Amino acid sequence: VFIFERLCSIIYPEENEVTEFFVTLEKDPQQEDFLQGRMPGNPYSSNEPGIGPLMRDIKNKICQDCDLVALLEDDSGMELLVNNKIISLDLPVAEVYKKVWCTTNEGEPMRIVYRMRGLLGDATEEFIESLDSTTDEEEDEEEVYKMAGVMAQCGGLECMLNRLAGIRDFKQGRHLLTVLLKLFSYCVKVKVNRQQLVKLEMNTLNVMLGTLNLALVAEQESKDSGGAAVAEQVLSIMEIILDESNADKDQLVMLLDQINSTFVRSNPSVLQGLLRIIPYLSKMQILVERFKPYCNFDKYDEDHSGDDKVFLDCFCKIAAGIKNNSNGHQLKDLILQKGITQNALDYMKKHIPSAKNLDADIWKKFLSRPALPFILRLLRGLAIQHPGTQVLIGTDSIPNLHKLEQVSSDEGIGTLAENLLEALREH
């Protein structure tokens, strides 16, 4: 653990948190007669209750200790000044100390002058709203994390993967697992490390999926085990590695079991991360049959459970994420053979209005059907780069889709129909 912590601190030196500093809380000398009370505890330690984490907490402490109750609920009524600059109450006291005070008065207690706003006229002092540079310049990770590039050359990534694969007990391994994943999050910032991790010889995907499964099982057995945070980190690292790689079916089924898992459902972040990696990984027959009941559109319009909706949205996202390769084609062929595409076309043919006036109430009522957005998204996802699906939709549905693409609705049905027609133009 200590070796990997030391490697993290070499790659990305966390700025030394200012462990303890002192502050003095003084009245504006020009408001001495207007402000009741005085702060008696000068200098105050940064570790003292009410001295942070925000400048607002100091303002609230001054209002409380000086009995200025009317200013306690009003964040606009009191100003805090450091080095004759007005400091935003949203800023961290430790950052104000480091970035504003220590620039001129390093090692002295930070003098905070407090005053009532507008009592002597308009403030003429500079207002510091953000301690961070106003410039939105983005730090170059390839330069910021440049030292992580050594891990590709020294066999460091291979050592880290072997260490990750060696962790069989989540409870004992948690601390090592957290440090290794922190180090991986720095390593994936650098292109040389991403390209090394993409090599099949590294077995990166299987090790990461093993670590994900270990974290998911640990959180299912014991709530708040920390498996959730580990699973989220693994899913984020996997997304980056799988994206670089693109720039088995049993594992896909294990991932869908997680969509069913209440833990993953209750954890939107883990579910989101999981739903982002599922496309890249694309048994299959069983899961396609499992998504077939989720295609009760008429029933969906009548009534559907939050899960039915979530599952129908997830199936639309899966269908859109199926890549153009032999296995992706076989999965789309299986979905076509299971009749899911035909059932979506039969629903549209049954419910589409014959009225020529698109503003008619019958059209509004058709466009507001709950299943219709999901049908158009699903059909698009299945049609992209899949001639069998394109031909089936292109047989009889073009005149109806071409009516739909012309409609504006609050559900965006016209735009969804146009996007489906654009996917069908591949054929």
From Swiss-Prot:
It is linked to Episodic ataxia 8: A form of episodic ataxia, a neurologic disorder characterized by episodes of poor coordination and balance. EA8 affected individuals have attacks of unsteadiness, general weakness, and slurred speech. Additional variable features include twitching around the eyes, nystagmus, myokymia, and persistent intention tremor. Inheritance is autosomal dominant. It comes from the Eukaryota. The UBR-type zinc finger forms a pocket that mediates recognition of type 1 N-degrons. In addition to substrate-binding, the UBR-type zinc finger probably positions substrate proteins in the proximity of the bound and activated E2-ubiquitin conjugate to enable their ubiquitination. This is E3 ubiquitin-protein ligase UBR4. The lineage of its organism: Eukaryota, Metazoa, Chordata, Craniata, Vertebrata. Belongs to the UBR4 family. It is found in: Cytoplasm; Cytoplasm, Cytoskeleton; Nucleus. E3 ubiquitin-protein ligase involved in different protein quality control pathways in the cytoplasm. Component of the N-end rule pathway: ubiquitinates proteins bearing specific N-terminal residues that are destabilizing according to the N-end rule, leading to their degradation. Recognizes both type-1 and type-2 N-degrons, containing positively charged amino acids (Arg, Lys and His) and bulky and hydrophobic amino acids, respectively. Does not ubiquitinate proteins that are acetylated at the N-terminus. Component of the SIFI complex, composed of KCMF1, UBR4 and calmodulin (CALM1, CALM2 or CALM3). Interacts with E2 conjugating enzymes UBE2A and UBE2B. Interacts with RB1. Coiled coil: none annotated.
